[PDB]
Amino acid sequence: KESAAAKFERQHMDSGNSASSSSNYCNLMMCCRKMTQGKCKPVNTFVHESLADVKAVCSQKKVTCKDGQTNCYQSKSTMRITDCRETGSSKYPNCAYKTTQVEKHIIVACGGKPSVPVHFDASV
Template structure:
């Protein structure tokens, strides 16, 4: 219990520090949304309920059950460094995506899940992701794949 409280405080401090260093260029709203929906550097919950807790905590089950989401378990500086990788084509055809190898947890809604009782199955892995980046310097604004 004490470890969970410590980790929760550490997450809160991390998110607050990210607020302080957010870029004032590019698309700050989209950057903040990316952080909220996809970044969990210390994987604050280590159990089968990880996705259920995180999807609710990050407000992705407020109006409906989001079908799929990926949480990246890297610090924001490692994630931002992906924006320096060569560009690749995004799913929408734009050329502002970049790829990098990271630790992730994919959260997939279970077939029996119904709003407001959204339920998710976690799948942890290390894989290559693609993120869209905008701004100068570029910051992540969209999780592409």
């Protein structure tokens, strides 16, 4: 049972986050996308291109995954992505991340039928 006091803090308190969206993007997104539950996911990449363009990567340059598997593909062009990396002061449940925006080629593993992205491998 969530106590009234705990409920109040969850619904109405935001003292920790900086008012700059440029800086708090990862903190908020990592939390919204459930990657801070139980443990703070160390690193994560978000892609800002269209879903169609990311799915199109599955029929582009074939490359070997970092884990030795062979269903990885590299994007023909760079894509706008955001790197979220856990900071030194991060400590679950207080997960903290540094947000970094860059434009790189991405490598994703594809699977299923039709073949779609199922794993983000890397950015080059």
